[PDB]
Amino acid sequence: GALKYLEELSKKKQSDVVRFLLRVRCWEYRQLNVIHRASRPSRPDKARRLGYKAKQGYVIYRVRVRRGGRKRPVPKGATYGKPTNQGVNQLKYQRSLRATAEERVGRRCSNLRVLNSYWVNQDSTYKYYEVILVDPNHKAIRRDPRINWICNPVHKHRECRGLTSTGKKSRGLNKGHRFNKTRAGRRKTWKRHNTLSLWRYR
Amino acid sequence: AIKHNQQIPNNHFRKHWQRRVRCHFDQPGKKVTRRLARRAKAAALAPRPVDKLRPIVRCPTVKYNRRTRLGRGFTLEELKAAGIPRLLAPTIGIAVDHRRKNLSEESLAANVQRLKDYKARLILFPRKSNKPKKADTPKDQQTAETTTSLRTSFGVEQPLAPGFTEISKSEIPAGIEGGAYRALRKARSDARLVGVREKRAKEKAEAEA
Amino acid sequence: APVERTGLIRGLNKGHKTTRRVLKERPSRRKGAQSKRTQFVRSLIREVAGLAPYERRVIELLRNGKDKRARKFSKKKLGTFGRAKRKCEELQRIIAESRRAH
Amino acid sequence: QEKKERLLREATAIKEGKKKEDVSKKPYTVKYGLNHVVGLIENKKASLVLIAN
RNA sequence: AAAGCUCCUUCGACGAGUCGAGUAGUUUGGGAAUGCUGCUCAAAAUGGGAGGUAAAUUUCUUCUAAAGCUAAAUACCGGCC
RNA sequence: GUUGACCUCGGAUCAGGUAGGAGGACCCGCUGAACUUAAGCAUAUCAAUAAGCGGAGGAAAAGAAACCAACAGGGAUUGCCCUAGUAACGGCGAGUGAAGCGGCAACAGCUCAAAUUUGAAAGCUGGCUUCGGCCCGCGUUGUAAUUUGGAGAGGAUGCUU
Numbered sequence: 017g018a019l020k021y022l023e024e025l026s027k028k029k030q031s032d033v034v035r036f037l038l039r040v041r042c043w044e045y046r047q048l049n050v051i052h053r054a055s056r057p058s059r060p061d062k063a064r065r066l067g068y069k070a071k072q073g074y075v076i077y078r079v080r081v082r083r084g085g086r087k088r089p090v091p092k093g094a095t096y097g098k099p100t101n102q103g104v105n106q107l108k109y110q111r112s113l114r115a116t117a118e119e120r121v122g123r124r125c126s127n128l129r130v131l132n133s134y135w136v137n138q139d140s141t142y143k144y145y146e147v148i149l150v151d152p153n154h155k156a157i158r159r160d161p162r163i164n165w166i167c168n169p170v171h172k173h174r175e176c177r178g179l180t181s182t183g184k185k186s187r188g189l190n191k192g193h194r195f196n197k198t199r200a201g202r203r204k205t206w207k208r209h210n211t212l213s214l215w216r217y218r
Numbered sequence: 219a220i221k222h223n224q225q226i227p228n229n230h231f232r233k234h235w236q237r238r239v240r241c242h243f244d245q246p247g248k249k250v251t252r253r254l255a256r257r258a259k260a261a262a263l264a265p266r267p268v269d270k271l272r273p274i275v276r277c278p279t280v281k282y283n284r285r286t287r288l289g290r291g292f293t294l295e296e297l298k299a300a301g302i303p304r305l306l307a308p309t310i311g312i313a314v315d316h317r318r319k320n321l322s323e324e325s326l327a328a329n330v331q332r333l334k335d336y337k338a339r340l341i342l343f344p345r346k347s348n349k350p351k352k353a354d355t356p357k358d359q360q361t362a363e364t365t366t367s368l369r370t371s372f373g374v375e376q377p378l379a380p381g382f383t384e385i386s387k388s389e390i391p392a393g394i395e396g397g398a399y400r401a402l403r404k405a406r407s408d409a410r411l412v413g414v415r416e417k418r419a420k421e422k423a424e425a426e427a
Numbered sequence: 428a429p430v431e432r433t434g435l436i437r438g439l440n441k442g443h444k445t446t447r448r449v450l451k452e453r454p455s456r457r458k459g460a461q462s463k464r465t466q467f468v469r470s471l472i473r474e475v476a477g478l479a480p481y482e483r484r485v486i487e488l489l490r491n492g493k494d495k496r497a498r499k500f501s502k503k504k505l506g507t508f509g510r511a512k513r514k515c516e517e518l519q520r521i522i523a524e525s526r527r528a529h
Numbered sequence: 530q531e532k533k534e535r536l537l538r539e540a541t542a543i544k545e546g547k548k549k550e551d552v553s554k555k556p557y558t559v560k561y562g563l564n565h566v567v568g569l570i571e572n573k574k575a576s577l578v579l580i581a582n
Numbered sequence: 583a584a585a586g587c588u589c590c591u592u593c594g595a596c597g598a599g600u601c602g603a604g605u606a607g608u609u610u611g612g613g614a615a616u617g618c619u620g621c622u623c624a625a626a627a628u629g630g631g632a633g634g635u636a637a638a639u640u641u642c643u644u645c646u647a648a649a650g651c652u653a654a655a656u657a658c659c660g661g662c663c
Numbered sequence: 664g665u666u667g668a669c670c671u672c673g674g675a676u677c678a679g680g681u682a683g684g685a686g687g688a689c690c691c692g693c694u695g696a697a698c699u700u701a702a703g704c705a706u707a708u709c710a711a712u713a714a715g716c717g718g719a720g721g722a723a724a725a726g727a728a729a730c731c732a733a734c735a736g737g738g739a740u741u742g743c744c745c746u747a748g749u750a751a752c753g754g755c756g757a758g759u760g761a762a763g764c765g766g767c768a769a770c771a772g773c774u775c776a777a778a779u780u781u782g783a784a785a786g787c788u789g790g791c792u793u794c795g796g797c798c799c800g801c802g803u804u805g806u807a808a809u810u811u812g813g814a815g816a817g818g819a820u821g822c823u824u
């Protein structure tokens with residue numbers, strides 16, 4: 017096959033052939049709208065690895081985000097509290113930039129289900145992503161047991177809750193001693209450790 | 219404040235604890251609900267037992283490694299030794315675990331015998347009653363007294379080793395050469411000095427030539 | 428059958444005696460091995476793509492004789508001492524092959 | 530349309546009694562498909578390759 | 583036509599601006615830094631992660647990340663009884 | 664020159680569809696205090712709580728190991744009892760604080776990417792239809808069958824389903 021070579025070549029982001037392609041494409045985008053549709057994936061190997069198929073009901077969108085930190089929005093710089101939380105500048109957002117891209121694409125196409133997303137480009141001001149979506153009302157989708165699990169009503173707006181690959185990472189859903197506090201849900205676990213249980217025959 | 223001779227108190231009641239208090243007034247009610255579900259489940263599995271066959275396994279720390287209990291499922295090597303295909307096993311009431319390994323001969327032998335005891339007591343009804351197959355019970359043995367627990371009929375017969383036995387005098391063994399206490403001190407001392415002695419021998423041999 | 432335990436706690440190969448056995452390796456334990464396909468592809472991609480900017484800098488230090496500099500530079504780029512050492516060996520192999528073929 | 534005609538001829542032969550490979554001969558065509566052709570190159574079966582620009 | 587079992591010389595593809603490293607903020611019982619996120623650097627093929635005191639050298643153990651689905655035991659008197 | 668393709672981007676009260684609001688006791692995330700305690704007070708505490716914002720169901724979420732361990736080894740996920748007011752954190756002040764093992768309730772396993780069907784895209788949406796199919800379209804920049812590490816592929820071999 018040919019997608020094996022593409023996977024190897026995509027690792028050499030600092031080579032001459034790849035640096036040229038990234039520079040040219042990053043200019044082509046940023047001349048288009050902030051959110052727009054793509055006719056086909058620009059990374060055929062990466063999208064197929066994440067679940068993309070070439071049949072009716074799969075669509076691709078492209079989006080760019082502002083690529084920085086998060087400034088605390090308050091009138092001027094007053095916080096009206098104690099000195100330990102009066103910082104305004106060097107604070108950070110607890111979700112990823114990749115997550116924000118998925119949420120904004122989901123609102124534009126509100127009849128579709130978000131599957132995954134990947135990185136295509138970046139520069140000093142923006143990062144660029146491509147998002148994969150599936151039509152849950154198309155007949156060719158409801159016919160296939162490998163994908164029709166997404167037509168059920170428990171998967172409405174997965175990206176708004178953290179049920180995509182990037183959402184799982186930020187929640188901390190891994191096994192072992194390092195992920196003690198978040199393994200099964202941070203707020204659920206805190207409630208269990210703070211409950212006073214009284215039995216009948218104490 | 220404190221005023222007399224007391225134990226220093228530490229009562230963790232400085233949050234809004236009254237928002238999270240779980241009483242159990244439904245303890246008898248939940249017990250009735252569980253028994254109804256077990257009775258319904260047993261009726262659905264009409265002649266079959268209500269459980270699965272488990273293997274015997276030993277606990278993992280220096281505390282508790284003297285005892286045995288039931289595990290999750292049989293290994294792939296145990297199933298092959300008994301002669302049971304891995305696809306057939308979970309459809310006749312046997313549990314399977316694909317990530318446990320046999321590091322010894324003791325555990326392997328114990329579980330292999332357990333499987334062939336079960337295979338001897340099994341009754342297989344044919345898929346179609348008018349066309350029985352040569353691997354099915356020939357229906358003259360289909361009538362017998364059965365069990366429906368599999369956790370009492372195939373439990374842990376003895377989890378601990380016998381605590382007392384008797385031997386004839388003059389057959390008692392002789393001790394270790396210097397005594398049991400001295401043997402323990404020597405074994406500890408050797409471990410603390412293994413690195414020092416190896417380095418000393420190495421530099422001596424290198425300086426020899 | 429690596430070794431047989433002594434039979435007492437608190438020793439050098441302490442523990443309860445047991446007849447150990449050797450196992451055939453699980454297919455999960457093959458992860459790091461090489462294969463004919465993955466060697467062929469990686470060879471062709473390196474020829475097409477070429478080198479990276481930090482790689483060229485190390486190549487010049489190595490063939491210029493400096494070695495503490497090349498190692499100290501690679502660690503700053505890659506991050507750890509173990510990865511830096513493996514990279515310098517690979518680039519040294521490229522240097523040798525290039526000036527030996529022709 | 531050609532394939533449907535060929536399958537009809539083969540089905541008739543089976544019904545008559547003969548098997549296939551008695552009515553249809555070995556085909557010769559041009560190969561295509563990116564993954565299909567890359568494999569033919571590596572196994573050294575291709576004679577000439579034409580690449581779109 | 584399709585399916586299971588017993589043996590074997592040889593083969594045996596395995597997820598990248600990802601892991602990892604530095605630095606800033608927040609958080610955790612986690613202490614030369616437990617998790618998350620921003621910026622800079624940026625991999626490999628018996629390779630890679632972990633092995634609760636920072637570092638170099640030599641061994642050992644245990645799994646196989648960066649794609650995905652799935653009932654029961656658990657919570658709740660808001661809704662209808 | 665004429666004519667015919669392909670790629671990208673548009674129009675239409677074109678044929679057929681789909682989302683918003685309510686509810687929010689319980690569930691999944693983001694954002695975020697001060698009163699109070701320390702007999703004063705800034706790190707700390709109250710609290711990873713109240714208020715604010717987005718998204719679901721009868722349950723949700725989690726889930727079939729890049730786990731625990733250091734043993735004669737256990738073996739997906741969740742909940743109760745115990746571990747334990749313990750290891751540890753802390754103007755080491757006031758205060759805070761888990762996990763492995765052990766018994767039980769309930770038990771269930773799986774599918775993709777990375778391989779040439781190449782002796783035959785074997786796959787699918789839509790329209791019309793005696794009902795048997797026909798027609799355009801999607802798709803080779805890859806739709807079916809086959810394989811998922813517990814393996815498997817390729818060879819032997821002769822029983823069984």
Ligand SMILES: [K+]
Pocket residue numbers: 095096097696
């Ligand atoms: K405030």
Ligand SMILES: [K+]
Pocket residue numbers: 100101
């Ligand atoms: K602070």
Ligand SMILES: [K+]
Pocket residue numbers: 098100
């Ligand atoms: K404070």
Ligand SMILES: [K+]
Pocket residue numbers: none
């Ligand atoms: K960081």
Ligand SMILES: [K+]
Pocket residue numbers: none
């Ligand atoms: K290792």
Ligand SMILES: [K+]
Pocket residue numbers: 633
């Ligand atoms: K360590």
Ligand SMILES: [K+]
Pocket residue numbers: none
């Ligand atoms: K159009």
Ligand SMILES: [K+]
Pocket residue numbers: 688
């Ligand atoms: K209530």
Ligand SMILES: [K+]
Pocket residue numbers: 715
């Ligand atoms: K609110």
Ligand SMILES: [K+]
Pocket residue numbers: 746
């Ligand atoms: K204990």
Ligand SMILES: [K+]
Pocket residue numbers: 784
């Ligand atoms: K076709």
Ligand SMILES: [K+]
Pocket residue numbers: none
């Ligand atoms: K397929």
Ligand SMILES: [Mg+2]
Pocket residue numbers: 072
């Ligand atoms: Mg299309």
Ligand SMILES: [Mg+2]
Pocket residue numbers: none
């Ligand atoms: Mg899930």
Ligand SMILES: [Mg+2]
Pocket residue numbers: 189190
């Ligand atoms: Mg996971």
Ligand SMILES: [Mg+2]
Pocket residue numbers: 245249
């Ligand atoms: Mg009771």
